[PDB]
């Protein structure tokens, strides 16, 4: 009375995992609010963990974005008229610039030498300093310091190189997780003005919108559009879902994410500066954060609608364990009851 | 290197020294081989003095060596020196197949001179021949080569004579004699224009004096050229990214055209230094940017082999071939081996082997149609030439159909044994370490199955069905062959389903397939995601017909059969849309119709959830050079995918009469709702009056640019033709409901939706507070 009490449990495993329900869950927002890295969490956490394998598919990738952050960053000597401060790194500045981006594999003698002695320039350093007035990703800083452990032979990254890598997302995909009580589909789109026209295609049947926000939008411009405030453009876009006929007895989740860049650029540049009205202490890591997160919620036409925020951080993955924990708990109860 | 320009080596530049031989004629003349520099044609001096050119593009397989065809004729074997002293006379023996389709191909024999001057050469000639940006090239390039073709035919004087020209564009004569005159080159004398003062530049103001081109002129009229005679680097640099990129892509993956960028497009095409000295394009100009190498219909990515091979083996479209071995009616019709050979040169990655019994004097097995009048090829020279030509398009996995009626385990163990004496290490005797043959197991990937060749015979008369319902039980020798592919008979979906073998597999006949896709169709394409599904047409079809294959598309069959002898409307399609993915004959499948946990309707007239639907538009402006005679020519453009998608019923009016130079206004040709486009295809095909074909394309729904661009026509068989193409306009675009246009609006730029309507709120304030 073994194999046949056996299958009598087996058949119940299979009871549950069938008979339980999945919530359709939207992770929107503006360009590069961290919305990809998100769902890379979820898959750590929650998802098939990353295998070796599966870390080694990244390795090209990044090589990809020390290049195509470096290649940005020479152009910006030029744009911004900063000076080379050595002029024996004026060679290797020739020969980064004509280095295809997309065809790149290896990483070598050749450039590995290169890359390094640009980053120690510092006209270079000047350089990443003005970031915000072109366009250079965010893990640039991550990457170019540990320039010598991606120049080894045999580097394999590690899961926290894999959150960080930039590859933009595209389209609609639809990634489920299984949370053993209930399975989460989790729709993934793009962030920029022309995959909006897109998301259209997957609003039908919604149970929540985790909307994302990147606090260190707010003196950046607009990749699309470089006339424009980037948290302005979070502000509005969130204006506009929310107003939404579709989303009417759909729960809305805030998550404020980037939350520790926000901590770096308040003690230097005011946020008195960009959004006027802004009563509270300059160089503020607090109230900073608070005046922000007040800014998106008193944006409510529906009076009723409890909007939930937590302020995130994309990359910790034991951020997302404690503000999913609440989340989960949050979706689960406003659903079944 | 990914896909390079076909560049022509030292050797086939100057051209070595070989011996041109005919059997049917018994000619043995020698000749010097010659190849141009671009790669368009190969000629030689004729035995008349003559000029006698081969288009390149027109090459099936160039066979070097053992592989090579050797003479047949006792007297022609002596004079080449068969019953000599070497046995070097086979590694100088070069055979050269062309044609347009694969039943029709004359065959090119040649003998080199030199010791392995004949290998070097075959191998060379292939990479041309094949090559992908050679075939999908712009349409200044295909001008050039019919600018080639004339600069070769010269007569015995060494010149190029009047009448090649006027046979040429034979769509006129009159206005071609002022044409030249106006050039200057005097024909007028001995009716022959030398090559010196015929260079590519006379050839060009000869077209744009000769061909009228009204249509450009209106073009340059829209993108702010009232001030008609130029264009700024402004107007240009916009019309290019409002008009020519494709609204579907990002923003940040594929930039807009830069003003310095811009330039670099002046300067190659502008030929006058006074516009080009002032940043502008001339009329002149923008005429070749319209035709040039980027400005094109279609992406690179889309022709390259840029598509995941690493997903299951039944996740995939596959090119299939149903009684290969027949090149004719499939009853009183010759079979042949040398159309296994040009199956697997196509793209075609299964072929079908319909084995039999022996005689009793010998004992070899052969192969044939079931008692039916047709002739009878052996079996070992079919594998043979199967392991020849089978990884030459294409190194990606084949699949040989045994459609096993052989009776006896004297010849079948024969055959077991003739497979892996011929194939060798690419046949899968044994299933890989990491995907073992148990329930629940994934098929394998086509990478995974890279070079190897898979058998599909059972392991442990019918009026429709053909010869195929009475097959003969299989035996243990070549049981052990087969594996990941097992024909099993098909019981009902969920047996076969919930059973979880995905290396099983069933047959399905046209009409038996037909029934259960419109009976049962979820429960189709969820089979399909696991296991796979090969489909063959019926034996009502006794002269080689062809059904839709993408009915069976749609529910996710990946072996959707057809007759490679015959090229009809079906037969068109399967041709021109394995031509991408780098004419691997694997095309991989849409999100949906290969994922477990989602679950869609081949049948819906809605839009579905997730997947990104578009709408495209197509207008048909004008054409070029589409006959040799002047006569009306009318336009088609039909989609092809889901049925709710499907509209094969536009078509433009019959042309002026112009053969020409022919100008259609006509309104769009709208396709506003395209549920599912990563399946759909799109297709532009030119007819004569009274139905005489002249030039169909193929083109993807997914990948297709919008705005103004030329389209290459090519025959039948996909191969492209040199002059004719057509001047079409597109608008594909992400598809937003009519309800919802002013909801997708703010999305796209919630700065003014907010603004806008939040300033009338505030304004309209002091009226009620
Ligand atoms: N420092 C920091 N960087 C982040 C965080 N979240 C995302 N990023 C980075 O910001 C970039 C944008 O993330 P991604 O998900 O690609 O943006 P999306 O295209 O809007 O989904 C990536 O390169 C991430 O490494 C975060 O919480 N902190
Ligand atoms: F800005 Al994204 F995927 F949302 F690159
Ligand atoms: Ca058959
Ligand atoms: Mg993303």
Known sequence: ?337 | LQLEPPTVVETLRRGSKFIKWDEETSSRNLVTLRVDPNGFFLYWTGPNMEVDTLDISSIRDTRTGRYARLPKDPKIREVLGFGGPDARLEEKLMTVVSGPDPVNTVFLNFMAVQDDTAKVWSEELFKLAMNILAQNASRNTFLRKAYTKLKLQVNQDGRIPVKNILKMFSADKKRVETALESCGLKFNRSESIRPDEFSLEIFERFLNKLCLRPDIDKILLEIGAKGKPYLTLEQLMDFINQKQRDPRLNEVLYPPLRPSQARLLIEKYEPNQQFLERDQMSMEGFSRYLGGEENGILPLEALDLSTDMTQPLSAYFINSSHNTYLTAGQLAGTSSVEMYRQALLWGCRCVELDVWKGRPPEEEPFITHGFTMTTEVPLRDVLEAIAETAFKTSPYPVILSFENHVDSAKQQAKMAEYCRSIFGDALLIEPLDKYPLAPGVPLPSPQDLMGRILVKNKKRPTTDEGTASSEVNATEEMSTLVNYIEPVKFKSFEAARKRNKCFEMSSFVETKAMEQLTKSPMEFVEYNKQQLSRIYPKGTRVDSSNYMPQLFWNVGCQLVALNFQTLDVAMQLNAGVFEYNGRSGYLLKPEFMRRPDKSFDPFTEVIVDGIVANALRVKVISGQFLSDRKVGIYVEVDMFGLPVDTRRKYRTRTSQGNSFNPVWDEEPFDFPKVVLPTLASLRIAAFEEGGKFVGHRILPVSAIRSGYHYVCLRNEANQPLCLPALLIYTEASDYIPDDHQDYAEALINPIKHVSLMDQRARQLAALIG
């Not at chain 1, 998100?38 to 394998?53: A, L």
């Not at chain 1, 030498?113 to 510092?122: E, T, Y």
């Not at chain 1, 926000?213 to 006339?227: K, T």
């Not at chain 1, 005011?270 to 008193?298: C, N, S, T």
């Open chain 1, 1 to 337: 009375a073994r194999r046949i009490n056996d299958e009598i449990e087996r058949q119940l495993r299979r009871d549950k995992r069938d008979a339980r329900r999945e919530l359709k869950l939207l992770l929107l927002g503006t360009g590069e609010s961290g919305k990809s890295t998100f769902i890379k969490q979820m898959r750590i956490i929650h998802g098939s963990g990353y295998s070796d394998e599966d870390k080694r598919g990244f390795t090209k990738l990044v090589y990809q974005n020390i290049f195509t952050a470096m290649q940005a960053m020479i152009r910006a000597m030029d744009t911004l008229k900063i000076p080379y401060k050595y002029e024996h790194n004026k060679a290797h500045a020739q020969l980064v610039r004509e280095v295809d981006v997309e065809k790149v594999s290896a990483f070598e003698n050749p450039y590995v030498d290169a890359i390094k002695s640009l980053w120690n320039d510092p006209g270079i350093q000047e350089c990443y300093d003005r970031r915000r007035e072109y366009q250079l990703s965010d893990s640039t800083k991550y990457y170019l310091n540990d320039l010598d452990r991606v120049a080894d032979p045999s580097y394999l990254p590690t899961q926290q190189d894999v959150l960080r890598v930039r590859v933009p997302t595209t389209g609609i995909i639809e990634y489920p997780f299984d949370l053993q009580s209930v399975i989460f589909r989790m729709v993934d789109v793009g962030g920029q003005r022309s995959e909006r026209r897109k998301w259209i295609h997957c609003f039908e049947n919604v149970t929540s919108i985790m909307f994302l926000v990147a606090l260190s939008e707010y003196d950046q411009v607009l990749v699309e559009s470089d006339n424009e405030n980037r948290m302005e453009e979070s502000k509005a876009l969130f204006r506009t879902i929310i107003t939404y006929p579709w989303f009417q007895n759909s729960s809305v989740i805030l998550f404020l994410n980037k939350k520790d860049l926000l901590e770096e650029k308040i003690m230097y540049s005011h946020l008195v500066d960009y959004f006027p009205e802004y009563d509270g202490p300059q160089r503020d890591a607090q109230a900073a954060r608070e005046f922000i997160l007040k800014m998106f919620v008193d944006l409510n036409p529906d009076s009723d609608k409890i909007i939930y925020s937590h302020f995130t951080c994309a990359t910790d993955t034991e951020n997302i364990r404690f503000v999913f924990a609440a989340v989960k708990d949050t979706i689960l109860q406003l659903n079944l009851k």
